[model samples]
Target: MTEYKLVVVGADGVGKSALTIQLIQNHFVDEYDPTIEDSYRKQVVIDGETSLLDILDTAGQEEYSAMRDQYMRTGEGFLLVFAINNTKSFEDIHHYREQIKRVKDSEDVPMVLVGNKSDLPSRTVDTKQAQDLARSYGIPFIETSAKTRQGVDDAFYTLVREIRKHKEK
Candidate 1:
Protein backbone atom coordinates (compact mmCIF):
# COMPACT_ATOMS: atom_id res chain seq x y z
CA MET A 1 0.00 0.00 0.00
CA THR A 2 1.21 3.50 -0.81
CA GLU A 3 1.67 5.98 2.01
CA TYR A 4 0.17 9.44 1.90
CA LYS A 5 1.21 12.25 4.25
CA LEU A 6 -1.53 14.28 5.92
CA VAL A 7 -1.06 17.29 8.18
CA VAL A 8 -3.50 18.25 10.94
CA VAL A 9 -3.31 21.99 11.60
CA GLY A 10 -5.02 24.62 13.78
CA ALA A 11 -4.43 27.19 16.52
CA ASP A 12 -3.85 26.24 20.14
CA GLY A 13 -6.74 24.74 22.07
CA VAL A 14 -8.57 24.04 18.82
CA GLY A 15 -8.64 20.29 19.51
CA LYS A 16 -6.30 19.36 16.65
CA SER A 17 -4.61 16.67 18.71
CA ALA A 18 -7.91 15.48 20.06
CA LEU A 19 -9.27 14.89 16.58
CA THR A 20 -6.16 13.06 15.45
CA ILE A 21 -5.94 10.99 18.60
CA GLN A 22 -9.58 10.06 18.36
CA LEU A 23 -9.17 9.06 14.75
CA ILE A 24 -5.94 7.10 15.13
CA GLN A 25 -6.28 5.71 18.66
CA ASN A 26 -10.06 5.47 18.91
CA HIS A 27 -10.08 7.16 22.30
CA PHE A 28 -10.92 10.56 23.68
CA VAL A 29 -8.01 12.45 25.22
CA ASP A 30 -8.98 15.12 27.71
CA GLU A 31 -5.58 16.39 28.72
CA TYR A 32 -4.43 19.57 27.08
CA ASP A 33 -0.73 20.27 26.67
CA PRO A 34 1.37 22.13 24.18
CA THR A 35 2.56 19.90 21.36
CA ILE A 36 5.75 20.19 19.37
CA GLU A 37 4.85 17.85 16.53
CA ASP A 38 3.84 14.22 16.38
CA SER A 39 3.20 11.65 13.65
CA TYR A 40 0.71 8.79 13.64
CA ARG A 41 0.20 5.97 11.16
CA LYS A 42 -2.92 4.08 10.19
CA GLN A 43 -4.01 1.97 7.25
CA VAL A 44 -7.33 3.13 5.79
CA VAL A 45 -9.44 1.89 2.90
CA ILE A 46 -10.24 4.52 0.36
CA ASP A 47 -12.36 3.74 -2.68
CA GLY A 48 -11.87 0.00 -1.94
CA GLU A 49 -8.07 0.22 -1.80
CA THR A 50 -6.05 0.12 1.37
CA SER A 51 -3.45 2.84 1.91
CA LEU A 52 -1.10 3.89 4.70
CA LEU A 53 -1.96 7.30 6.14
CA ASP A 54 0.80 9.18 7.89
CA ILE A 55 -0.80 11.88 10.02
CA LEU A 56 1.22 14.78 11.36
CA ASP A 57 -0.48 16.34 14.35
CA THR A 58 1.03 19.77 14.73
CA ALA A 59 1.44 22.04 17.74
CA GLY A 60 -1.13 24.82 17.75
CA GLN A 61 1.09 27.17 19.79
CA GLU A 62 2.88 30.09 18.23
CA GLU A 63 6.26 28.92 19.45
CA TYR A 64 6.27 26.33 16.68
CA SER A 65 5.89 28.78 13.84
CA ALA A 66 9.37 28.02 12.47
CA MET A 67 8.74 24.30 12.62
CA ARG A 68 5.28 24.57 11.07
CA ASP A 69 6.63 25.66 7.71
CA GLN A 70 8.93 22.65 7.65
CA TYR A 71 6.09 20.31 8.57
CA MET A 72 3.74 21.91 6.05
CA ARG A 73 6.18 21.19 3.24
CA THR A 74 5.83 17.41 3.53
CA GLY A 75 2.04 17.17 3.56
CA GLU A 76 0.25 15.91 0.45
CA GLY A 77 -3.03 16.92 2.07
CA PHE A 78 -4.06 18.95 5.11
CA LEU A 79 -6.90 19.26 7.61
CA LEU A 80 -7.26 22.91 8.54
CA VAL A 81 -9.01 22.43 11.84
CA PHE A 82 -10.55 25.08 14.10
CA ALA A 83 -12.46 24.94 17.34
CA ILE A 84 -16.18 25.59 16.78
CA ASN A 85 -16.31 27.23 20.20
CA ASN A 86 -13.57 29.72 19.45
CA THR A 87 -14.14 32.45 16.93
CA LYS A 88 -10.47 33.47 16.93
CA SER A 89 -9.43 30.03 15.89
CA PHE A 90 -11.78 30.20 12.94
CA GLU A 91 -10.32 33.56 11.98
CA ASP A 92 -6.87 32.02 11.66
CA ILE A 93 -7.97 29.72 8.88
CA HIS A 94 -6.85 32.05 6.15
CA HIS A 95 -3.36 32.34 7.60
CA TYR A 96 -2.94 28.59 7.59
CA ARG A 97 -4.30 28.34 4.03
CA GLU A 98 -1.90 31.00 2.74
CA GLN A 99 1.03 29.31 4.46
CA ILE A 100 0.17 25.97 2.89
CA LYS A 101 0.04 27.53 -0.56
CA ARG A 102 3.35 29.28 -0.02
CA VAL A 103 5.02 26.13 1.23
CA LYS A 104 3.45 23.77 -1.29
CA ASP A 105 3.84 26.30 -4.09
CA SER A 106 0.43 25.44 -5.51
CA GLU A 107 -3.02 26.89 -5.16
CA ASP A 108 -4.59 23.49 -5.86
CA VAL A 109 -3.30 21.74 -2.77
CA PRO A 110 -5.73 19.22 -1.37
CA MET A 111 -7.30 20.30 1.94
CA VAL A 112 -10.37 20.08 4.16
CA LEU A 113 -11.55 22.77 6.54
CA VAL A 114 -12.56 21.09 9.79
CA GLY A 115 -14.60 22.47 12.69
CA ASN A 116 -13.78 20.58 15.86
CA LYS A 117 -15.63 20.50 19.21
CA SER A 118 -18.91 20.02 17.40
CA ASP A 119 -20.47 18.39 20.43
CA LEU A 120 -20.42 21.64 22.34
CA PRO A 121 -23.79 23.37 22.56
CA SER A 122 -22.31 26.85 22.74
CA ARG A 123 -20.45 27.15 19.51
CA THR A 124 -19.23 30.61 18.60
CA VAL A 125 -18.53 29.74 14.99
CA ASP A 126 -21.73 29.03 13.16
CA THR A 127 -21.97 26.13 10.71
CA LYS A 128 -23.13 28.36 7.92
CA GLN A 129 -20.18 30.71 8.41
CA ALA A 130 -17.75 27.81 8.25
CA GLN A 131 -19.48 26.38 5.20
CA ASP A 132 -19.22 29.72 3.44
CA LEU A 133 -15.52 29.91 4.22
CA ALA A 134 -14.94 26.42 2.87
CA ARG A 135 -16.88 27.25 -0.25
CA SER A 136 -14.77 30.36 -0.79
CA TYR A 137 -11.64 28.28 -0.43
CA GLY A 138 -13.08 25.54 -2.66
CA ILE A 139 -12.42 22.82 -0.12
CA PRO A 140 -14.59 20.36 1.76
CA PHE A 141 -15.80 21.26 5.28
CA ILE A 142 -16.90 19.00 8.10
CA GLU A 143 -17.94 19.39 11.74
CA THR A 144 -16.38 16.87 14.12
CA SER A 145 -16.49 16.05 17.82
CA ALA A 146 -13.36 14.37 19.08
CA LYS A 147 -15.13 13.65 22.33
CA THR A 148 -18.04 11.75 20.87
CA ARG A 149 -16.22 10.69 17.67
CA GLN A 150 -18.90 12.32 15.59
CA GLY A 151 -17.81 13.22 12.09
CA VAL A 152 -14.18 12.35 12.89
CA ASP A 153 -13.84 9.48 10.46
CA ASP A 154 -15.74 11.37 7.82
CA ALA A 155 -13.26 14.25 7.98
CA PHE A 156 -10.30 11.99 7.32
CA TYR A 157 -12.15 10.12 4.63
CA THR A 158 -13.06 13.36 2.94
CA LEU A 159 -9.45 14.52 3.09
CA VAL A 160 -8.10 11.30 1.60
CA ARG A 161 -10.66 11.48 -1.18
CA GLU A 162 -9.59 15.02 -1.98
CA ILE A 163 -5.96 13.97 -2.00
CA ARG A 164 -6.63 11.07 -4.29
CA LYS A 165 -8.50 13.31 -6.69
CA HIS A 166 -5.59 15.74 -6.73
CA LYS A 167 -3.11 12.95 -7.45
CA GLU A 168 -5.14 11.77 -10.41
CA LYS A 169 -5.01 15.22 -11.98
Candidate 2:
Protein backbone atom coordinates (compact mmCIF):
# COMPACT_ATOMS: atom_id res chain seq x y z
CA MET A 1 0.00 0.00 0.00
CA THR A 2 3.04 2.26 0.07
CA GLU A 3 4.43 1.77 -3.39
CA TYR A 4 2.99 3.83 -6.27
CA LYS A 5 3.80 3.76 -9.95
CA LEU A 6 4.11 7.23 -11.42
CA VAL A 7 4.99 8.14 -14.97
CA VAL A 8 5.98 11.41 -16.58
CA VAL A 9 4.90 11.88 -20.20
CA GLY A 10 5.36 14.82 -22.50
CA ALA A 11 6.67 16.04 -25.84
CA ASP A 12 10.20 17.25 -26.55
CA GLY A 13 11.82 19.54 -24.01
CA VAL A 14 8.86 19.72 -21.73
CA GLY A 15 11.30 19.45 -18.80
CA LYS A 16 10.28 15.89 -18.06
CA SER A 17 13.85 14.95 -17.27
CA ALA A 18 14.38 18.12 -15.38
CA LEU A 19 11.31 17.60 -13.26
CA THR A 20 12.06 13.96 -12.57
CA ILE A 21 15.67 14.66 -11.82
CA GLN A 22 14.68 17.50 -9.59
CA LEU A 23 12.28 15.30 -7.71
CA ILE A 24 14.48 12.25 -7.24
CA GLN A 25 17.69 14.15 -6.60
CA ASN A 26 19.53 12.94 -3.49
CA HIS A 27 16.54 10.80 -2.58
CA PHE A 28 17.25 7.60 -4.47
CA VAL A 29 15.89 4.52 -2.76
CA ASP A 30 18.54 2.08 -1.61
CA GLU A 31 16.19 -0.79 -0.89
CA TYR A 32 16.41 -4.10 -2.76
CA ASP A 33 19.16 -2.66 -4.94
CA PRO A 34 16.52 -2.05 -7.59
CA THR A 35 17.73 -1.90 -11.15
CA ILE A 36 17.01 1.53 -12.56
CA GLU A 37 17.59 1.04 -16.26
CA ASP A 38 15.69 4.06 -17.58
CA SER A 39 13.36 4.62 -14.65
CA TYR A 40 13.79 5.81 -11.08
CA ARG A 41 12.71 4.50 -7.72
CA LYS A 42 12.65 6.79 -4.74
CA GLN A 43 11.29 6.51 -1.25
CA VAL A 44 9.57 9.69 -0.21
CA VAL A 45 7.23 10.85 2.48
CA ILE A 46 4.02 12.41 1.25
CA ASP A 47 1.22 13.85 3.35
CA GLY A 48 2.50 12.24 6.56
CA GLU A 49 2.91 8.85 4.94
CA THR A 50 6.09 7.22 3.67
CA SER A 51 5.72 5.96 0.10
CA LEU A 52 7.95 4.64 -2.61
CA LEU A 53 7.47 6.27 -5.99
CA ASP A 54 8.47 4.16 -8.94
CA ILE A 55 8.81 6.71 -11.70
CA LEU A 56 8.93 6.17 -15.45
CA ASP A 57 9.80 9.18 -17.54
CA THR A 58 9.06 8.86 -21.24
CA ALA A 59 10.15 12.19 -22.44
CA GLY A 60 11.22 12.89 -26.01
CA GLN A 61 13.25 9.72 -26.06
CA GLU A 62 14.90 8.02 -29.01
CA GLU A 63 12.24 6.25 -31.10
CA TYR A 64 10.74 4.74 -27.97
CA SER A 65 7.20 5.76 -28.82
CA ALA A 66 6.38 2.15 -29.48
CA MET A 67 7.11 1.37 -25.84
CA ARG A 68 4.41 3.70 -24.61
CA ASP A 69 2.02 0.85 -24.15
CA GLN A 70 4.56 -1.06 -22.11
CA TYR A 71 4.98 1.64 -19.50
CA MET A 72 1.45 2.99 -19.57
CA ARG A 73 0.18 -0.36 -18.42
CA THR A 74 2.47 -0.29 -15.41
CA GLY A 75 1.86 3.30 -14.49
CA GLU A 76 -0.93 3.85 -11.99
CA GLY A 77 -0.54 7.62 -11.97
CA PHE A 78 0.95 10.01 -14.50
CA LEU A 79 2.04 13.58 -14.86
CA LEU A 80 0.96 14.73 -18.30
CA VAL A 81 3.54 17.43 -18.77
CA PHE A 82 3.83 20.16 -21.42
CA ALA A 83 5.97 23.21 -21.74
CA ILE A 84 4.20 26.52 -21.28
CA ASN A 85 6.28 28.25 -23.93
CA ASN A 86 5.52 25.64 -26.55
CA THR A 87 2.19 25.44 -28.34
CA LYS A 88 2.82 22.16 -30.11
CA SER A 89 3.48 20.44 -26.82
CA PHE A 90 0.21 21.68 -25.44
CA GLU A 91 -1.65 20.68 -28.60
CA ASP A 92 -0.15 17.19 -28.38
CA ILE A 93 -1.34 16.71 -24.84
CA HIS A 94 -4.73 15.39 -25.94
CA HIS A 95 -3.24 12.57 -27.95
CA TYR A 96 -1.12 11.49 -24.99
CA ARG A 97 -4.18 11.51 -22.76
CA GLU A 98 -6.17 9.45 -25.23
CA GLN A 99 -3.26 7.08 -25.61
CA ILE A 100 -3.04 6.54 -21.87
CA LYS A 101 -6.75 5.85 -21.63
CA ARG A 102 -6.54 3.44 -24.52
CA VAL A 103 -3.67 1.64 -22.82
CA LYS A 104 -5.17 1.54 -19.33
CA ASP A 105 -8.65 0.69 -20.61
CA SER A 106 -9.97 3.24 -18.18
CA GLU A 107 -11.31 6.65 -18.99
CA ASP A 108 -10.69 8.08 -15.57
CA VAL A 109 -7.08 7.07 -15.13
CA PRO A 110 -5.13 8.69 -12.35
CA MET A 111 -3.48 11.62 -14.11
CA VAL A 112 -2.65 15.26 -13.69
CA LEU A 113 -1.87 18.15 -16.01
CA VAL A 114 1.61 19.60 -15.64
CA GLY A 115 2.51 22.87 -17.36
CA ASN A 116 6.27 23.06 -17.14
CA LYS A 117 8.77 25.82 -17.84
CA SER A 118 6.89 28.37 -15.84
CA ASP A 119 10.09 30.36 -15.41
CA LEU A 120 10.26 31.09 -19.10
CA PRO A 121 8.77 34.36 -20.27
CA SER A 122 8.10 33.56 -23.92
CA ARG A 123 4.89 31.82 -23.18
CA THR A 124 2.80 30.41 -25.99
CA VAL A 125 0.29 28.55 -23.83
CA ASP A 126 -1.60 30.46 -21.24
CA THR A 127 -2.08 29.31 -17.65
CA LYS A 128 -5.83 29.66 -17.84
CA GLN A 129 -5.85 27.58 -21.00
CA ALA A 130 -4.28 24.61 -19.22
CA GLN A 131 -6.40 25.16 -16.15
CA ASP A 132 -9.49 25.11 -18.32
CA LEU A 133 -8.34 21.93 -20.03
CA ALA A 134 -7.67 20.18 -16.74
CA ARG A 135 -11.03 21.38 -15.47
CA SER A 136 -12.69 19.63 -18.38
CA TYR A 137 -10.63 16.52 -17.88
CA GLY A 138 -11.58 16.41 -14.20
CA ILE A 139 -8.01 16.29 -12.93
CA PRO A 140 -5.69 18.55 -11.04
CA PHE A 141 -3.30 20.89 -12.89
CA ILE A 142 0.02 22.26 -11.75
CA GLU A 143 2.47 24.76 -13.19
CA THR A 144 6.01 23.65 -12.46
CA SER A 145 9.52 25.02 -12.92
CA ALA A 146 12.19 22.40 -12.59
CA LYS A 147 14.83 25.08 -12.61
CA THR A 148 13.28 26.65 -9.57
CA ARG A 149 12.04 23.41 -8.09
CA GLN A 150 8.58 24.81 -7.85
CA GLY A 151 5.57 22.58 -7.62
CA VAL A 152 7.71 19.60 -8.59
CA ASP A 153 6.98 17.48 -5.56
CA ASP A 154 3.36 18.53 -5.50
CA ALA A 155 2.89 17.25 -9.04
CA PHE A 156 4.18 13.81 -8.06
CA TYR A 157 2.49 13.85 -4.68
CA THR A 158 -0.80 14.80 -6.27
CA LEU A 159 -0.58 11.79 -8.58
CA VAL A 160 -0.09 9.51 -5.59
CA ARG A 161 -3.09 11.12 -4.02
CA GLU A 162 -5.03 10.70 -7.25
CA ILE A 163 -4.35 6.99 -7.21
CA ARG A 164 -5.54 6.79 -3.63
CA LYS A 165 -8.75 8.49 -4.68
CA HIS A 166 -9.03 6.22 -7.70
CA LYS A 167 -8.80 3.20 -5.44
CA GLU A 168 -11.84 4.32 -3.47
CA LYS A 169 -14.15 3.84 -6.45
Candidate 3:
Protein backbone atom coordinates (compact mmCIF):
# COMPACT_ATOMS: atom_id res chain seq x y z
CA MET A 1 0.00 0.00 0.00
CA THR A 2 1.41 3.32 -1.02
CA GLU A 3 1.10 6.48 1.06
CA TYR A 4 -0.34 9.70 -0.35
CA LYS A 5 0.00 13.10 1.26
CA LEU A 6 -3.35 14.59 0.38
CA VAL A 7 -4.46 18.04 1.56
CA VAL A 8 -8.07 18.94 2.31
CA VAL A 9 -8.53 22.69 2.43
CA GLY A 10 -11.17 25.40 2.43
CA ALA A 11 -12.88 28.03 4.58
CA ASP A 12 -13.48 27.53 8.31
CA GLY A 13 -16.43 25.36 9.36
CA VAL A 14 -16.86 24.31 5.75
CA GLY A 15 -16.73 20.68 6.83
CA LYS A 16 -13.15 20.00 5.69
CA SER A 17 -12.60 17.88 8.81
CA ALA A 18 -16.15 16.61 8.72
CA LEU A 19 -15.75 15.42 5.13
CA THR A 20 -12.46 13.70 5.92
CA ILE A 21 -13.92 12.11 9.07
CA GLN A 22 -16.91 10.78 7.18
CA LEU A 23 -14.76 9.43 4.37
CA ILE A 24 -12.19 7.86 6.69
CA GLN A 25 -14.45 6.68 9.57
CA ASN A 26 -17.93 6.76 8.05
CA HIS A 27 -19.00 9.13 10.84
CA PHE A 28 -20.12 12.72 10.64
CA VAL A 29 -18.62 15.27 13.04
CA ASP A 30 -20.60 18.42 13.72
CA GLU A 31 -18.09 20.20 15.94
CA TYR A 32 -15.40 22.27 14.25
CA ASP A 33 -12.13 22.32 16.17
CA PRO A 34 -10.31 25.56 15.59
CA THR A 35 -6.66 25.12 14.61
CA ILE A 36 -4.93 28.40 13.92
CA GLU A 37 -1.66 27.17 12.45
CA ASP A 38 -1.82 23.40 12.15
CA SER A 39 -3.12 20.40 10.25
CA TYR A 40 -4.43 16.89 10.92
CA ARG A 41 -3.29 13.61 9.38
CA LYS A 42 -5.02 10.24 9.13
CA GLN A 43 -4.52 6.88 7.44
CA VAL A 44 -7.34 5.59 5.32
CA VAL A 45 -7.88 3.01 2.60
CA ILE A 46 -9.25 4.36 -0.63
CA ASP A 47 -9.74 2.43 -3.84
CA GLY A 48 -8.66 -0.69 -1.96
CA GLU A 49 -5.28 0.82 -1.06
CA THR A 50 -3.92 1.97 2.31
CA SER A 51 -2.46 5.47 2.12
CA LEU A 52 -1.55 8.24 4.52
CA LEU A 53 -4.01 11.07 3.90
CA ASP A 54 -2.54 14.30 5.26
CA ILE A 55 -5.60 16.48 5.73
CA LEU A 56 -4.96 20.20 6.11
CA ASP A 57 -8.14 21.48 7.71
CA THR A 58 -7.05 25.09 7.43
CA ALA A 59 -8.21 28.13 9.38
CA GLY A 60 -10.24 29.96 6.76
CA GLN A 61 -11.37 32.80 9.01
CA GLU A 62 -8.06 33.37 10.77
CA GLU A 63 -4.97 35.32 9.79
CA TYR A 64 -3.45 32.38 7.92
CA SER A 65 -1.68 34.23 5.13
CA ALA A 66 1.73 33.25 6.43
CA MET A 67 0.47 30.08 8.12
CA ARG A 68 -0.92 28.59 4.91
CA ASP A 69 2.27 29.27 2.93
CA GLN A 70 4.27 27.07 5.28
CA TYR A 71 1.64 24.34 5.48
CA MET A 72 1.17 24.04 1.71
CA ARG A 73 4.85 23.62 0.93
CA THR A 74 4.61 19.82 0.93
CA GLY A 75 1.22 19.48 -0.68
CA GLU A 76 1.01 16.61 -3.19
CA GLY A 77 -2.68 16.45 -3.81
CA PHE A 78 -5.66 18.50 -2.67
CA LEU A 79 -9.34 18.15 -1.95
CA LEU A 80 -10.38 21.80 -2.05
CA VAL A 81 -13.72 21.92 -0.28
CA PHE A 82 -16.49 24.54 0.05
CA ALA A 83 -19.95 24.70 1.58
CA ILE A 84 -22.85 24.69 -0.84
CA ASN A 85 -25.17 26.33 1.68
CA ASN A 86 -22.89 29.35 1.87
CA THR A 87 -22.45 31.21 -1.42
CA LYS A 88 -19.75 33.41 0.04
CA SER A 89 -17.71 30.40 0.98
CA PHE A 90 -18.11 28.95 -2.48
CA GLU A 91 -17.04 32.24 -3.99
CA ASP A 92 -13.87 32.27 -1.93
CA ILE A 93 -12.41 29.15 -3.57
CA HIS A 94 -10.70 31.30 -6.19
CA HIS A 95 -8.62 32.90 -3.48
CA TYR A 96 -7.90 29.56 -1.87
CA ARG A 97 -6.60 28.08 -5.15
CA GLU A 98 -4.41 31.13 -5.73
CA GLN A 99 -3.05 30.83 -2.22
CA ILE A 100 -2.27 27.17 -2.84
CA LYS A 101 -0.55 28.01 -6.13
CA ARG A 102 1.65 30.52 -4.33
CA VAL A 103 2.67 28.04 -1.64
CA LYS A 104 3.26 25.16 -4.05
CA ASP A 105 4.13 27.45 -6.97
CA SER A 106 2.00 25.44 -9.37
CA GLU A 107 -1.53 25.39 -10.65
CA ASP A 108 -1.08 21.93 -12.15
CA VAL A 109 -1.54 20.16 -8.83
CA PRO A 110 -4.28 17.54 -8.60
CA MET A 111 -7.38 19.10 -7.00
CA VAL A 112 -11.14 18.89 -6.93
CA LEU A 113 -13.72 21.37 -5.75
CA VAL A 114 -15.95 19.76 -3.14
CA GLY A 115 -19.32 21.19 -2.17
CA ASN A 116 -20.04 20.04 1.35
CA LYS A 117 -23.31 19.75 3.35
CA SER A 118 -25.40 18.45 0.50
CA ASP A 119 -28.20 17.18 2.71
CA LEU A 120 -29.33 20.67 3.57
CA PRO A 121 -32.45 21.78 1.74
CA SER A 122 -31.62 25.46 1.87
CA ARG A 123 -28.59 25.79 -0.40
CA THR A 124 -27.06 29.16 -1.15
CA VAL A 125 -25.16 27.91 -4.20
CA ASP A 126 -26.83 25.52 -6.58
CA THR A 127 -25.22 22.65 -8.45
CA LYS A 128 -25.09 24.61 -11.71
CA GLN A 129 -23.16 27.44 -10.13
CA ALA A 130 -20.64 25.02 -8.69
CA GLN A 131 -20.30 23.20 -11.99
CA ASP A 132 -19.77 26.47 -13.79
CA LEU A 133 -16.96 27.49 -11.48
CA ALA A 134 -15.36 24.07 -11.79
CA ARG A 135 -15.67 24.20 -15.54
CA SER A 136 -14.06 27.61 -15.69
CA TYR A 137 -11.22 26.40 -13.51
CA GLY A 138 -10.94 23.11 -15.42
CA ILE A 139 -11.52 21.09 -12.24
CA PRO A 140 -14.16 18.59 -11.26
CA PHE A 141 -16.78 19.19 -8.54
CA ILE A 142 -19.05 17.14 -6.28
CA GLU A 143 -21.65 17.81 -3.61
CA THR A 144 -21.11 15.86 -0.40
CA SER A 145 -23.23 15.08 2.66
CA ALA A 146 -21.31 13.77 5.66
CA LYS A 147 -24.51 13.55 7.67
CA THR A 148 -26.19 11.19 5.21
CA ARG A 149 -23.01 9.83 3.70
CA GLN A 150 -24.29 11.10 0.40
CA GLY A 151 -21.49 11.49 -2.12
CA VAL A 152 -18.97 11.23 0.71
CA ASP A 153 -17.07 8.40 -0.90
CA ASP A 154 -17.97 9.80 -4.27
CA ALA A 155 -15.99 12.94 -3.54
CA PHE A 156 -12.78 11.14 -2.57
CA TYR A 157 -13.16 8.43 -5.12
CA THR A 158 -13.67 10.85 -7.94
CA LEU A 159 -10.81 13.12 -6.89
CA VAL A 160 -8.41 10.25 -6.41
CA ARG A 161 -9.38 8.98 -9.77
CA GLU A 162 -8.64 12.35 -11.26
CA ILE A 163 -5.29 12.64 -9.50
CA ARG A 164 -4.13 9.20 -10.53
CA LYS A 165 -5.14 9.86 -14.06
CA HIS A 166 -2.92 12.93 -14.15
CA LYS A 167 0.09 11.62 -12.21
CA GLU A 168 3.37 12.56 -13.90
CA LYS A 169 6.05 10.06 -14.76
The 0-to-1 C-alpha lDDT of every candidate, in the order given, reads 0.89, 0.84, 0.76
| Residue 160, candidate 1: C-alpha displacement in angstroms | 0.6
Q: What is the Å distance of residue 75 in model 2 from its true position?
A: 0.7
The TM-score, computed over Cα atoms with residue i paired to residue i, of candidate 1 is 0.93
The top-ranked prediction according to TM-score is 1
Model 1 steric clash pairs: none
**Which candidate model has the greater lDDT, 1 or 3?**
1
lDDT of 1 by residue, 102-141 (tens): 9888999999999999899889999999999999999999
Across 114-152, the per-residue lDDT of candidate 2 in tens digits comes to 999898899999999999999999999999998888898
Tell me model 1's lDDT, rounded to 2 decimals.
0.89
Q: In each prediction, how many residue pairs overlap at the backbone (N, C-alpha, C within less than 3 A)?
A: 0, 0, 0
- Our model 3 lands, by Cα RMSD against the true structure, at 2.4
lDDT measured at residue 28 in model 3 versus the true structure, 0 to 100: 77
Residue 120, candidate 2: C-alpha displacement in angstroms: 0.9
lDDT of 3 by residue, 1-169 (tens): 6556667878777888787777767787787575653455556677788866655555545555676567677777777788888888888898878877878877677788999888888899989999998898788898888788888777766766676776853
Weakest 10 consecutive residues of candidate 1 by summed lDDT:
60-69
- TM-score for all models, in order of appearance: 0.93, 0.87, 0.84
What is residue 129's positional error in candidate 1, in angstroms?
0.5
